CSV table of all heavy atoms in Angstrom, one decimal:
chain,number,residue,atom,x,y,z
B,397,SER,N,-32.1,25.7,16.8
B,397,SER,CA,-32.8,24.6,17.5
B,397,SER,C,-33.8,23.9,16.6
B,397,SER,O,-34.5,24.5,15.8
B,397,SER,CB,-33.5,25.2,18.7
B,397,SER,OG,-34.6,26.0,18.4
B,398,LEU,N,-33.8,22.5,16.8
B,398,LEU,CA,-34.9,21.7,16.4
B,398,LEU,C,-36.0,21.5,17.4
B,398,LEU,O,-35.7,21.2,18.6
B,398,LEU,CB,-34.4,20.3,16.0
B,398,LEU,CG,-34.3,19.7,14.6
B,398,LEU,CD1,-33.7,18.3,14.6
B,398,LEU,CD2,-35.7,19.7,13.9
B,399,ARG,N,-37.3,21.5,16.9
B,399,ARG,CA,-38.4,21.0,17.7
B,399,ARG,C,-39.1,19.9,16.9
B,399,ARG,O,-39.6,20.2,15.8
B,399,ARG,CB,-39.4,22.1,18.1
B,399,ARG,CG,-40.3,21.8,19.2
B,399,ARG,CD,-41.1,23.0,19.6
B,399,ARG,NE,-42.5,22.7,20.0
B,399,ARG,CZ,-43.5,22.2,19.3
B,399,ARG,NH1,-43.2,22.0,18.0
B,399,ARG,NH2,-44.7,22.0,19.8
B,400,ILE,N,-39.2,18.7,17.5
B,400,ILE,CA,-39.9,17.6,17.0
B,400,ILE,C,-41.2,17.5,17.8
B,400,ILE,O,-41.2,17.3,19.0
B,400,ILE,CB,-39.2,16.3,17.0
B,400,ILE,CG1,-37.9,16.4,16.2
B,400,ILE,CG2,-40.0,15.2,16.5
B,400,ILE,CD1,-36.7,15.6,16.7
B,401,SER,N,-42.4,17.7,17.1
B,401,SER,CA,-43.7,17.6,17.7
B,401,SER,C,-44.3,16.2,17.4
B,401,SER,O,-43.8,15.5,16.5
B,401,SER,CB,-44.6,18.7,17.3
B,401,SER,OG,-44.4,19.0,15.9
B,402,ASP,N,-45.4,15.9,18.1
B,402,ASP,CA,-46.1,14.6,17.9
B,402,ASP,C,-45.1,13.5,17.6
B,402,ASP,O,-45.0,13.0,16.5
B,402,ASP,CB,-47.2,14.8,16.8
B,402,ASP,CG,-47.8,13.4,16.3
B,402,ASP,OD1,-47.8,12.4,17.1
B,402,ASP,OD2,-48.2,13.3,15.1
B,403,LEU,N,-44.5,13.1,18.7
B,403,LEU,CA,-43.3,12.1,18.6
B,403,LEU,C,-43.7,10.7,18.2
B,403,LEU,O,-44.7,10.2,18.7
B,403,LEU,CB,-42.5,12.1,19.9
B,403,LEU,CG,-41.5,13.3,20.2
B,403,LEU,CD1,-41.2,13.4,21.6
B,403,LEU,CD2,-40.3,13.0,19.4
B,404,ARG,N,-42.9,10.1,17.4
B,404,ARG,CA,-43.1,8.7,17.0
B,404,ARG,C,-41.9,7.9,17.4
B,404,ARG,O,-40.8,8.4,17.7
B,404,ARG,CB,-43.3,8.6,15.5
B,404,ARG,CG,-44.1,9.7,14.8
B,404,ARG,CD,-45.5,9.5,14.8
B,404,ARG,NE,-46.3,10.6,14.4
B,404,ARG,CZ,-46.7,10.9,13.2
B,404,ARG,NH1,-46.3,10.1,12.2
B,404,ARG,NH2,-47.4,12.0,12.9
B,405,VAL,N,-42.0,6.5,17.5
B,405,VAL,CA,-40.9,5.6,17.8
B,405,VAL,C,-39.8,5.6,16.8
B,405,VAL,O,-38.7,5.3,17.0
B,405,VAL,CB,-41.4,4.2,18.1
B,405,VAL,CG1,-42.6,4.2,19.1
B,405,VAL,CG2,-41.7,3.4,16.9
B,406,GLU,N,-40.2,6.0,15.5
B,406,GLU,CA,-39.2,6.1,14.4
B,406,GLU,C,-38.4,7.4,14.6
B,406,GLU,O,-37.4,7.5,13.8
B,406,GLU,CB,-39.9,6.1,13.1
B,406,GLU,CG,-40.5,4.7,12.6
B,406,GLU,CD,-39.5,3.6,12.9
B,406,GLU,OE1,-38.3,3.8,12.6
B,406,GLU,OE2,-39.9,2.5,13.3
B,407,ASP,N,-38.7,8.2,15.6
B,407,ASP,CA,-37.8,9.3,15.9
B,407,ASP,C,-36.6,9.0,16.8
B,407,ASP,O,-35.7,9.8,16.9
B,407,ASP,CB,-38.6,10.5,16.5
B,407,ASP,CG,-39.4,11.2,15.5
B,407,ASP,OD1,-39.2,11.1,14.2
B,407,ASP,OD2,-40.4,11.8,15.9
B,408,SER,N,-36.6,7.8,17.4
B,408,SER,CA,-35.6,7.4,18.3
B,408,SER,C,-34.2,7.3,17.5
B,408,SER,O,-34.2,7.0,16.3
B,408,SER,CB,-35.9,6.0,18.9
B,408,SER,OG,-37.1,6.2,19.7
B,409,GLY,N,-33.2,7.7,18.2
B,409,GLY,CA,-31.9,7.9,17.6
B,409,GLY,C,-31.1,9.1,18.1
B,409,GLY,O,-31.6,9.9,18.9
Side-chain angles (χ1 to χ4, degrees):
Chain B
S397 69
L398 249 177
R399 199 177 147 288
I400 301 147
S401 40
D402 166 28
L403 279 161
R404 323 272 171 90
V405 313
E406 288 314 319
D407 288 337
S408 298

